[PDB]
């Protein structure tokens, strides 16, 4: 899966 995808809850 993508290490640059959104890491925050929203």
């Amino acid at each position, epitope marked *: *899966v993508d*290490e*640059n995808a*959104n*890491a*925050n*809850s*929203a």
Partner: antibody
Amino acid sequence: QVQLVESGGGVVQPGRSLRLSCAASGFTFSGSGMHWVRQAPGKGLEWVAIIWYDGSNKFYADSVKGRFTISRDNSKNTLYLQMNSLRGEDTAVYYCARVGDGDGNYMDVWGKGTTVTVSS
Amino acid sequence: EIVLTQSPGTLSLSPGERATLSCRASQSVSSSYLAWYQQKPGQAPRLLIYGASSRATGIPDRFSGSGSGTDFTLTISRLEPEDFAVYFCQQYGSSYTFGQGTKLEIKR
């Protein structure tokens, strides 16, 4: 006041382990992803690892993969970096940083850093 | 990996002048995920610009970012003494990589 405070830096013999911590305050820690970044003496910045808001996904730089583990305890507003099999080239100031609210995982708040020296 | 090359290595200017700092990526940066950071001696980095052109909270409007694709610029329009520092660019679209920094020093 949003603030990050790292601790746990010290001297470690090559091959041994150390755990760093980062204490967060002034925001809802469980809503933010978090990074570790490091800076060796006289050099630039090198990203180390990222962790999702809820501790699910974790990703690592190739230079630390298999040796370092990023983790967090949302109940204690705390971020951790477990460093194993340390080498001289891991000597650096280690910073924790918060993931910003605009698009993408840029670093919008940084701690003051903690120093790790790998040496016999 | 995406290599970011900053130029010049050192910029020597005086307060009141305009500074232009450049960052070139080896591959096109995805989603304009390009940020600029400031670092003073003994201090942690501080975010200035993200999304190539969005100013961070508390950053004064003399800082502005532009560019797209592989070529990005940070402009400081009228330098103040507190602006003399090292500046790093960073891409956060494919892993997380930094430029090697440009030092902005006082010319005397």
